[PDB]
RNA sequence: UAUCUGGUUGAUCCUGCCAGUAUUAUAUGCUGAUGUUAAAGAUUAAGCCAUGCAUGUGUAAGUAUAAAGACCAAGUAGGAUGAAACUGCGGACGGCUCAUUAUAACAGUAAUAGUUUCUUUGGUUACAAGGAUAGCUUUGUGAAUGAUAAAGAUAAUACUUGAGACAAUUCAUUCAAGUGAGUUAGGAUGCCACGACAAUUGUAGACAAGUAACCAAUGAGAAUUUCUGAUCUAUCAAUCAGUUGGUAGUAUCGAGGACUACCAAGAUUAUAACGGAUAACGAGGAAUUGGGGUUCGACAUCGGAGAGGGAGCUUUACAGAUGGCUACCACUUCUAAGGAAGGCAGCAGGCGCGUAAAUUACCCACUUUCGAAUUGAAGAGGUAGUGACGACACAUAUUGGAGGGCAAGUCUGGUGCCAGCAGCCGCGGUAAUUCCAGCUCCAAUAGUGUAUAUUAAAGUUGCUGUGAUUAAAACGCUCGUAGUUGAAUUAAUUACUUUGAAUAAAAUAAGGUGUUUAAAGCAAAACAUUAUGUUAAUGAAUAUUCAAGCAUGGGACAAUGC
RNA sequence: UGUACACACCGCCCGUCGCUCCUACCGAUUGAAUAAAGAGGUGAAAUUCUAGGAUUCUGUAGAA
């Protein structure tokens, strides 16, 4: 190693470069969310895969294991504020049943749509990128803001 | 030798049998620095001293143009293909040419 | 200079040792100073950490002690008559620990074996057999 | 290296100083004295981070050299003086008397004290030896060689010291009915009661310490530091009262 | 503003000035994105001698 | 994501390989809006270097009439300040590199009852003497170095004598309490060597300051040493003679064949000794991984070694120092031709080498170190410049391809087995879906191909896990040592298993925290709408971590003799 | 029924000899050299011991 500041990769490329069954499924979401390219799909897929790996590893231990109680609640707690997982589902098994639409539907470009500020999801980018939008007390212009539950009713022009 | 204490033979069997690997042995024994005209280099710089036309193999007919190139490190002579169509015209003699393998690993 | 490391010796299996580093002052050795018999002469060697070793080059007198009579008296050494290690020490009358030396009992009025390190402490001290 | 070192790289510094990994290349090497390298907090770190009086080392030398710090009864003017265990630290200008005790997070903590309780400080005997001329003496955990001691002050007791006078006020033996604070590894910064000390002739002496809440944890005899007698503490314990939450 | 620390030894006060839009030290200021609110540290040395001597 | 597809045939099922694919690190082609972060002469030559800097240091407390003190300010023992010089401290840290090195070093672990300084901390122990010396003056030489000669003086916390009155070292004898364990700390007797607490300093910040030894700390430190652990090779099977042990001595800070004298014949080896290879510095760690693993680690941090090659030494507490000296070997520089210095594997920079790698910039303000000490220095460190090595967020355009593998043209011109394309099968001999073109569209996107190498694919190196009738592959057969494996049974150690103890950080997983999110960082803020308190705020228990080592609960499965 | 044939026996295919190119191996021969670790001879240099004592200090005695 040479540098002291850490760095990381936000996404991974698919193993099979050429599939028709994947080009349509990935282009279904691009139109449904106005994403710039295929990096956003991979990043969201990469994000979910990390949580699924924690629950997958943790389901192999006993319920009275000290690490299961502490780490298990930590993952469910984190998801609850983010709002990916519904509150009434409070078991690690429901983590594995999450999909890639749960994470993408909490993005800022998605949130400003369903709240009604942006007519079209392509129109949301210009408003978001133009700093027209505000989250509580801070101006935001990154369309990838994964809003939490508390900040859901705090999205205004 | 599957026994519990039989890790000495289980290890000596694998050391010997790995030398039969045609590919693993190649990158370990000392000929890459002597027999290989490139060494561990990705490319190589050389000088042109002859332009060659190689007749194709049996199921083809034609003349694949080529050159004879002497490197600067080893000093050996190697026959180098000309990449694209009509690219023999742009080649000359006593000039630097970069030489980088082919699709297959040497 | 003389060295005292084990990097120059063979292994317990007889295999030669392959060097890695040059000589170092920690394992420094020094020339012997065979304290012969003669006039008084010592030299102060500046050892490691600044400490000073009295290097007796030639000596004539020593403070011999008698165990039976509980008396220690200075005396002039006469002749080195026996050395348990090297008989060539007897010929040159070199004074080392354990050398059997005969002395004149002039203050004893009131055979010896040395029991000090003249090359380290700087003087001869012994006892009477 | 041909001799003793002088610099200290940031990452080689003891972990319990909590120095930012991107703060800088080097860390303040604590000069020698009473407390070891890894058992002490340098006086610069006490003021720059723990108390935030000085932002950088420019303003730390402007303070310690200004005769504005009194480590124990005496006054120290070394920027990197080794400030270790419960040795008291006092600032007359701001009128505050801290103290460096441990806590459950393996960290040195500055427990506030009053003026009266800052006049004394507990020490732990390390060894007792007979000097030349039959002048016995004892050595505390602070490296202090106290003069003619009490005859019963044995190797692993705890004594009470006075800053103004320098005498020995009270002394606590090492038995199975005393309160001890921990200066060790996993058990570091924990208060408890000595209940059992099993002896192995070979290497180490192992002491079982029972916590207030009934938790039992063992340790090495070295890390034991008697703090009182009969489930009583002679000093104000830190905020967490030496208790560990699982 | 924010946290204030009283420093008698350095004869100064360390206060984190929040801007909600020869005896003082104004440094360490970083705004937010696109302007607006700005934070910083305010140091007051009262005596001019302090600024005359207590400055790197 | 525990994944495969094309290619042997007229066709089918196999073994089997080639090609395809994804990822990491090096170069390179084409192209390039932003903001954050960031590697960068290691591979080839530890090859050679012009030039500039990288180590100096002064407080009231060592010596100062400098003819310096009109610049504060006066001055009769010298006013506060003081260039230079002596004296003290330092350049043994830091910084660079990876040639040497195969039980050596290194990692964990244990010992030092076998050694130990420096700095720092606690403590103990004659109202004042003597010479000479620099800066200073004067006379000089040589081309010259950080060049050196005589004479005239003048100081000490430089060099000595001397008192105010013990300690520690050697030897011989003796009495003897902590510790697992000591003829041990310690005391007593007798001579020997050494023998002090400056013959010291502020008039102002009696109180500091300073000094000489000796005990204890700093020391978990340093240095030696115990146990376990390393890649390939038998076209390396026997190796060693200070070698193995003993006694006496020598030397060392100290154990010790470390060395010397005498005596004995011993020590290692199929559990791989001895030797050979390395494009070998070791570890923390990195890449990739369902599990098991494979490859890598010069390079943040720790340990080792070196300064062109050996050798030998001085100074001091520590150097076998090389930004110290001497000689030899090999180079480079100045020259008045007589002579003289130099060691960029320090920071920039140059030549060479190669596929392959940045400014002859600014500043000690952050971190820290050095110093006579708050003030000076630091090419350490920070800032700035180059920087499609990489990583993160984010505008509105290129790269490669269009038979199959593999998403994309039964579109139009020439060529006619020629040019050519083509990783593999293959396409082209006049009607080319592949050539060179034009239009159209496929994939990725500020990125996209190529070449080489590592990992997965590879159950094509098999412990989990392969194959041996016929595809490659059971010795011609028997005996046999080492090795591996060994029936049932019982109402002192080891191995096994469970808990801990102890255990550098960074890194990995991870807890919290809205850097506009993210990479990041360990910061901050819900809040007191804030000086007040939440607040003595958070610091992940951060878990680990293999092979050894310590202790403990258990005795079924195993091992060693009685 | 056998097949090594599938353009299917007008199939396929072996070996010497002849042409061009390429790679490794041996090698009378000045062949043959270069760079790396031991035995004997010569052996600079600095340290240890010994002799010396130019000079200068106390006024030849002694010290350096």
UniProtKB/Swiss-Prot annotation, chain A:
User: Has keyword Ribosomal protein?
Assistant: yes
Q: What Gene Ontology molecular function terms does this protein carry?
A: rRNA binding; structural constituent of ribosome
Q: What keywords would UniProt list here?
A: Ribonucleoprotein, Ribosomal protein, RNA-binding, rRNA-binding
Q: Which domain of life is it from?
A: Eukaryota
Task: Output a single Gene Ontology CC term carried by this record.
Answer: cytosolic small ribosomal subunit
Domain S4 RNA-binding stretches: 106-157
One GO process term, biological-process aspect: translation
Give the protein family: Belongs to the universal ribosomal protein uS4 family.
Q: What is this protein called?
A: Small ribosomal subunit protein uS4
Q: Which organism is it from?
A: Entamoeba histolytica (strain ATCC 30459 / HM-1:IMSS / ABRM)
| Full-protein interval shown | 2 to 158 of 185
């Amino acid at each position: 190693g040479r540098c002291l500041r850490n760095h990381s990769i936000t996404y991974k490329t698919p193993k099979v470069p050429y599939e028709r069954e994947r080009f349509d499924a990935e282009l279904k979401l691009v139109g449904q969310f106005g994403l710039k390219n295929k990096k956003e799909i991979q990043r969201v897929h990469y994000m979910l895969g990390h949580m699924r790996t924690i629950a997958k590893v943790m389901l192999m231990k006993d319920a009275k294991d000290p690490k299961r109680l502490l780490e298990g609640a930590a993952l469910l707690r984190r998801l609850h504020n983010l709002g990916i997982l519904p509150r009434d589902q409070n078991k690690l098994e429901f983590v594995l049943a999450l999909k890639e639409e749960n994470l993408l539907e909490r993005r800022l470009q998605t949130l400003v749509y369903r709240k009604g500020f942006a007519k079209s999801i392509h129109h949301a980018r210009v408003l978001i990128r133009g700093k027209m939008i505000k989250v509580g007390k801070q101006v935001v212009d990154v369309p990838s803001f994964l809003v939490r539950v508390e900040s859901e009713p705090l999205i205004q022009l | 030798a599957r026994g519990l204490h039989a890790a000495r033979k289980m290890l000596a069997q694998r050391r010997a049998n790995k030398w039969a690997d045609k590919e693993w042995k190649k990158g370990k024994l000392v000929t890459r620095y002597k027999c290989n005209p490139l060494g561990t280099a990705s490319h190589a710089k050389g000088l042109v001293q002859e332009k060659l036309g190689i007749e194709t193999k049996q199921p083809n007919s034609g003349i694949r143009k080529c050159v004879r190139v002497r490197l600067l490190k080893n000093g050996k002579k190697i026959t180098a293909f000309v990449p694209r169509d009509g690219s023999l015209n742009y080649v000359n003699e006593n000039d630097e040419v970069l030489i980088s393998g082919f699709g297959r690993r040497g | 200079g003389i060295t005292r490391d084990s990097r120059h010796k063979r292994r317990a299996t007889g295999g030669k040792k392959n060097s890695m580093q040059k000589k170092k002052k920690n394992t420094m050795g020094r020339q012997p100073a065979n304290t012969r018999l003669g006039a008084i002469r010592v030299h102060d060697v500046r050892c490691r950490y600044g400490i000073i070793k009295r290097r007796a080059l030639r000596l004539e007198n020593g403070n011999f002690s008698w165990a039976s009579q509980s008396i220690t008296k200075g005396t002039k050494i006469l002749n080195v008559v026996y050395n348990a290690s090297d008989n060539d020490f007897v010929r040159t009358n070199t004074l080392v620990k354990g050398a059997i030396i005969e002395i004149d009992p002039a203050p004893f009025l009131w055979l010896a074996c040395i029991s000090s390190r003249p090359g380290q402490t700087g003087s001869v001290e012994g006892y009477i057999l | 290296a041909r001799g003793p070192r002088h610099h200290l790289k940031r990452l080689n510094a003891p972990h319990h100083w909590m120095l930012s990994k991107l703060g800088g290349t080097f860390a303040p090497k604590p000069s020698h004295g009473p407390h070891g390298m890894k058992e002490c907090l340098p006086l610069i770190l006490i003021l720059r981070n723990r108390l935030n009086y000085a932002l950088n080392g420019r303003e730390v030398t402007m303070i310690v050299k200004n005769r504005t710090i009194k480590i124990d009864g005496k006054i120290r003017t070394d920027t990197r003086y080794p400030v270790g265990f419960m040795d008291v630290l006092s600032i007359p200008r701001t009128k505050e008397n801290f103290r460096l005790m441990y806590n459950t997070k393996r960290r040195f903590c500055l427990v506030p004290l009053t003026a009266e309780q800052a006049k004394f400080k507990l020490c732990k005997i390390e060894k007792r030896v007979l000097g030349t001329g039959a002048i016995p003496y004892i050595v505390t955990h602070d490296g202090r060689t106290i003069r003619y001691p009490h005859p019963e002050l044995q190797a692993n007791d705890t004594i009470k010291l006075n800053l103004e006078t320098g005498k020995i006020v009270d002394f606590v033996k090492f038995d199975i009915g005393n309160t001890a604070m921990m200066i060790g590894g996993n058990g570091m910064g924990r208060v408890g009661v000595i209940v059992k000390r099993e002896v192995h002739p070979g290497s180490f002496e192992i002491v079982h310490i029972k916590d207030a809440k009934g938790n039992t944890f063992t340790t090495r005899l070295n890390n034991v530091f008697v703090i009182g007698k009969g489930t009583e503490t002679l000093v104000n314990l830190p905020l967490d009262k030496g208790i560990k939450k699982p | 503003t924010r946290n204030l620390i009283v420093n008698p030894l350095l004869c100064r006060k360390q206060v984190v000035v929040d801007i909600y839009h020869q005896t003082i030290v104004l440094n360490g200021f970083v705004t937010k994105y696109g302007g607006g609110k700005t934070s910083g540290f305010a140091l007051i040395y009262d005596t001019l001698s302090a600024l005359k001597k207590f400055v790197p």
